[PDB]
Every structure is written in structure tokens, then in C-alpha cells.
Amino acid sequence: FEVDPMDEPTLLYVLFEVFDVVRIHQPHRGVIEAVYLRTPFSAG
Amino acid sequence: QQVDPAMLAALQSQPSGVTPSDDWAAAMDRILALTTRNPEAFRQQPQANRFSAILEAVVPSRTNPTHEKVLAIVNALTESKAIRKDEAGLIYNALLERVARYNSTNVQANLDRLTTDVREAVAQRERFMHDTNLGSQVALNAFLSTLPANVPRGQEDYVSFISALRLLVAEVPQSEVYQSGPDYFFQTSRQGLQTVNLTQAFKNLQGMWGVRAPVGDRATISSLLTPNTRLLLLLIAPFTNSSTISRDSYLGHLITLYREAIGQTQVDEQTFQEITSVSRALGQQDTGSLEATLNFLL
């Protein structure tokens, strides 16, 4: 980007709308298990 | 309402939409576009729901039926009321902990043997709803091994009456006998009236099978019979042909005449169906549509 001039030091806030899904289930009584996804910045 | 419990296990744990993880032969049936109803329906799905099905069909997933085979058991135990219905969320919370604790090749094949005899060897439960030896045959064969077979008068009609009584509890699936206290009973229906005191009836009929009574005696048996014996003979009346106790015993004054009394109401009910339907055909007071109707029929 190229922006205006300012006074304060500023931060360029980017909000990538990138799919966050959680897939939880429990097969037992007190065993809950989470599966994540975000698909850039991958985690599972 | 259902017949089989494992179909409800296959209704509560299978995907309703067709997936290649479990039903491959129907998911591949529509990828190659070979289907009678709506053939051309898979090209026009985009790259989202093509590759999410066309990859998973030419190489299937490998799921675990441990959570599904137990619902074919936990349902099969609550259909037969072994477990309370308020409770099956605890035992499936305990069986799934069990068969994952001691899991093996064997138990995964031992549950699968047990989800077959709750399907095709639970046909005994279909069987003794018909033969009703729940409480009608083997609970009455203790009663016929209780009565004395040595009756002085009328040796032959004694063993033809109970031969017609075993047929009564056999041709009726609802009726049953049981042991409550030191005596046996017999109800003609579950959620039913007309309980006969079966021990206090054959003890009343003992010493009675041979009388050869005349036909001019009606109001003597208030000190001789008992009204439940008079009602047990009512419940034996439709399953008793004219060759059981022939003509001239006092039971021939009772069992034959009880069939005539049933023979009145099984045609006068058809008369009563006519009268209650012609009160609104001409216009009649519905309060006075039953007072004079019953008096003509009693």
C-alpha cells in the first residue's frame, strides 16, 4: 500500500478471511477432542 | 413399531446423504453418471463437491464401526425392556468404554456375532407372542400337574374340559396365567378384567362333574356354584363345541346355555348398531335413544 502522512506511529492491520473450522466430538464421558483448521497458517 | 433394532442403529448412526466412506456402491453409482433418476447431476457440481467425493470413492476411508455395533446391541436390549429407557445413555456410555478397554480382533468380531442373533435368533420373541408360553402354556402345565386326575363321577368329561381349557390359553395371545400367592389365576386380557380364581374354581367343580340334573332347577346353585366358576364357564363357552359335555350333565345346563346367552348378544349387537344409527336418521332425543333401547334387548 501507500498511505497518507500522519503524526503517530501506526500499524497496517490486515484481516485475512481464512477458514477457521473446529470439529469437536466426544466418544466417551469426559474425553472431548478438538480438530482445528485454518488454511493458510495451517494447524490441526 | 419396528421389527429389527439394528435398522434403528443404522438409522441413528449412518449419514443420510450418500457417502463413499460407508456406501461406496451408491456413491460411485452417481460419479460415473449412470443412474435412472437424474443421471446428469454430478458434472454440474463444482470443484468443491466433486473432489470431496471423487477422491474418497476411488480410495475409501477406513472408519471404525465400534460406535455403531454397540447401538445394535443397546437398542436390542431396550426393545425387550431389559434396560430402562431412561438409562441407555449410561450403558452405551459404559459399553463403549468396555469394548475400547479390552478391544482386540476378537471382540470386534464377537460383537458382530451378537448383532446377528438379535436379528435372526430373536425370532423366539416373535414366536412366543403367538404360542404365548410366556404365561399360558408352561405356567398352566404346572396347574394341570396340580389337579387330581381321579374324579369319581365323570372321569371322561373332566379331562375334556381341561383339554378345552389348554386350547383357550393357546388360541389367545393376550391371556395368561400366573403364580400369585398359593393359588393360580387367569386373566382374559392384559390390562384386563374378569380374573377367575382358578384354584377356587376347580375345587368348586370337584365333586360336581356327574350330577345328571333335571331341567326344572335354576336357583339352587347359589349355595352350590360360585360366580367366578359361573364366569370361568363363560370364558370356556366359545371354545367348547357340542361334543365336549353332551346333553344331560348339569354343565350341559350351563355350558350350552352360556353359548346361547353369548349367541343372543352376538346378533343383538348388530340390532343395537341399527337402532343407534336411526335415531339421527329421523331425529330422536339422544338422551331417550338408549333408555328404551336397552330395555328391549335385556
Distance between the termini of chain A: 32 Å
The chain pair forming the largest interface, with residue counts per chain, is: A-B, 3 and 5 residues
Annotation field: number of helices of chain A: 0
Return the string of H and E elements of chain B.
HHHHHHHHHEEEHHHHH
Q: Sketch the major β-sheet of chain B.
A: 3 strands, antiparallel
Structural domain tally of chain B: 2
Percent strand of chain A: 15-25%
- What is the topology, as strand order, of the major beta sheet of chain A? 1-2
Number of helices of chain B: 14
Write down how many β-strands of chain A occur, each being a DSSP E stretch of 2 or more residues.
2
Radius of gyration of chain B: 32 Å
> What helical percentage do the residues of chain A reach?
under 10%
What characteristic shape of chain A results from the CA principal axes?
elongated
Main location (chain B): virion
Protein name (chain B): Pre-hexon-linking protein IIIa
Subcellular location (chain B): Virion; Host nucleus
Region (Binding to hexon-linking protein) (chain B): 135-248
Model description:
- Chain A contains no helices and two strands.
- Chain A is an all-beta fold and 44 residues long.
- A two-stranded antiparallel sheet of chain A has the order 1-2.
- Chain B has a three-stranded antiparallel beta sheet.
- Chain B has two domains: 1-131, no CATH class; 135-298, no CATH class.
- Chain B is mainly alpha-helical.
- Chain B has helices spanning 6-12, 24-31, 48-58, 66-69, 71-79, 88-101, 105-114, 123-127, 155-166, 199-205, 227-235, 255-275, 279-282, 291-297, and strands at residues 176-180, 183-187, 196-197.
- In chain B, helix 1 packs across helix 5 (71-79) and helix 2 crosses helix 3 (48-58).
- Chain B has 14 helices and three strands.
- The two termini of chain B are 41 Å apart.
- The PDB classes it as virus.
